From a paper:
SLBRGspB exhibits narrow specificity for the sTa trisaccharide, as have other previously-characterized members of this evolutionary branch. To reveal how similar SLBRs could include or exclude different sialoglycans, we determined crystal structures of these five SLBRs at resolutions between 1.0 Å and 1.7 Å. This included a structure of SLBRGspB with improved resolution as compared to a previous report. Finally, molecular dynamics (MD) simulations of unliganded SLBRHsa and SLBRGspB predict that these loops exhibit considerably more flexibility than other parts of the protein.
Many streptococci adhere to protein-attached carbohydrates expressed on cell surfaces using Siglec-like binding regions (SLBRs). Siglec-like binding regions (SLBRs) are among the streptococcal adhesive modules that bind sialoglycans. SLBRs contain two adjacent modules: a Siglec domain, which shares some features with mammalian Siglecs, and a Unique domain13 with no close homologs outside of the family. The conserved sialic acid-recognition motif governs general specificity while sequence diversity in surrounding loop regions allows the SLBR to select between related sialoglycans.
Residue numbers in the entry: 399 to 600
């Protein structure tokens, strides 16, 4: 047995602050025999969930000739928004691994991928304002009205901190168009858009 086990894991695992998550990976091997205790989910440097993502949990079972790796946890309300490279590293009974420590290191530095590699994305779960913002012209808000909109979005999303948005500044990170459509750009460059028509009226 020189054939390595193969992990099937989604390319992105997206989790939301203040919520639980649950995803699965699968492992197969020509031998159908595994070392479950040496099948882990980890960051590059050591067999650990990783700095900043200490809440990333996993558990492994065997179902027929495959492993199922449950990837789960509870995301703190104030963990950093952004993404991380993580790895499912599986071992077969013969000791073959899907990705070696050296391969993981090359992939990290070169920005290439190994089998079992996934991007862990921490997102904010945006909420549309509950209370309507009343404006004189819904197709052309005043600057005073756009600031009311920013305030409403901040009040409807109280766990969104200044350090969570672009440039760590609410004014740069939460931008309002002429019709009140609001883009929230997070510190990682990802964006959520709230269409003005869902909370703006005349
Ligand atoms: Ca094998």
């Amino acid at each position: 047995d020189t054939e390595r086990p193969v992990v099937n894991v989604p390319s992105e695992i997206t989790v939301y602050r203040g919520e639980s998550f649950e995803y699965f990976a699968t492992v197969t091997d020509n031998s159908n025999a595994f070392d479950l205790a040496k099948t882990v989910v980890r960051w590059l440097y050591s067999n650990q969930p990783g700095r900043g993502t200490e809440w990333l949990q996993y558990s492994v079972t065997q179902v027929g000739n495959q492993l199922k790796v449950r990837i789960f946890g509870n995301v703190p309300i104030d963990t950093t928004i952004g993404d991380y490279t993580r790895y499912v590293v599986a071992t077969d009974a013969a000791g073959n691994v899907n990705a070696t420590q050296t391969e993981m290191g090359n992939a990290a530095v070169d920005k290439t991928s190994v089998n079992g590699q996934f991007k862990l994305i921490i997102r904010f779960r945006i909420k549309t304002p509950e209370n309507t913002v009343f404006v004189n012209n819904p197709n052309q808000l005043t600057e005073v009205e756009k600031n009311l909109v920013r305030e409403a979005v901040k009040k409807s999303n109280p766990d969104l901190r200044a350090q969570d948005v672009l440039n760590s500044n609410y004014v740069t990170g939460i931008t309002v168009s002429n019709n009140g459509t609001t883009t929230i750009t997070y510190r990682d460059g990802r964006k959520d858009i709230i269409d003005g028509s869902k909370f703006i009226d005349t």
